[PDB]
Each structure stands twice: as C-alpha cells, then as structure tokens.
Amino acid sequence: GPPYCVFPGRRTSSTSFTTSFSTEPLGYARMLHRDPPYERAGNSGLNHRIYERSLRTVIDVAPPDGHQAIANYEIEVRRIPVATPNAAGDCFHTARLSTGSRGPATISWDADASYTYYLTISED
C-alpha cells in the first residue's frame, strides 16, 4: 500500500536520529562516487549516508563495522513541498533494518529540488 509513516504522529526517542536535507537544482554540478562516506546517525548505533547516483537520491542505513543489527529499526522519509509554509508533507518512502541483517537498508527516488526531505531512523 501507500507508504505509512509512524513519525511525526509518534514522538521520537533518545536513540532516534532525525535530519533534513535539500536537493540542489539539477543543473548544479555534483561529483558522483560509487561508494560515498557513511556517517554516524546520531545516537542510534547505526550509520547512514545520503547521496546521489546517476539523478537518483539515495539513502543507505547500516550497522557499523560489519556488524548485524541487534534490533529492528524503522526508517522513514517525508517530503515537504518548498515555499509552502503551511504544507503538511507526505510520507514518501520507508524501509526496515531487521534484527540480524547486515544492511544496508536503502531508499531511493528520482532527485527533485522542489521538496525538503526529512529522515527519521528509530528502533522499534
């Protein structure tokens, strides 16, 4: 069915990670890479990366250091139309990192500069 987002209906916890990002106008040059750096996803115990590939926007979420996930995690992206301060936003894509998986959990979409994107990662 349509993507279902539990956040922001529910509140996030101390080990959740949230961030937002913009996509640049597609006429602005990027230097693309087959394997861009992972960064720690705040206090979640996971790593993440947000990048583009030939354009597609991609989010990967994985345990550190070749480990398996020790729990189940919900990964959600909402998109909010730009220049619309009263916009409600849409639940856009979701993914799961399941207990025992190695990852990454991945989400991708056709790159679009007309929305701001909001990522949440949380343990179930």
Describe this structure in words.
The protein has one domain (1-124). The chain has strands at 17-22, 39-40, 47-53, 56-62, 73-81, 90-97, 105-110, 115-123. Strand 5 and strand 6 (90-97) form a beta hairpin. The chain contains no helices and 8 strands. It has 124 residues and is mainly β. The strands form 2 sheets. Strands 1-8-5-6 form a 4-stranded antiparallel beta sheet, with no helix packed on it. 0% of the residues lie in helices and 44% in strands. It comes from Fusarium oxysporum f. sp. lycopersici. Keywords: Signal. This is Secreted in the xylem 3. The PDB classes it as unknown function. Keywords: effector, protein-protein interaction, beta-sandwich, unknown function. It forms a monomeric assembly.
Overall helicity: under 10%
- Termini separation: 20 Å
Order of helices and strands: EEEEEEEE
Major sheet? 4 strands, antiparallel
Mind telling me the C-alpha Rg?
15 Å
- As laid out across the biggest beta sheet, the strand order is 1-8-5-6
Please give the oligomerization state of what you see: monomer
Quantity of strands, as a count: 8
Residue fraction in strands? 35-45%
Main structural class: mainly beta
- The structural domain count equals 1
What's the tally of helices? 0
> Which term fits the overall shape?
globular
Feature tags:
mainly beta, four-stranded antiparallel β-sheet, 8 strands, globular
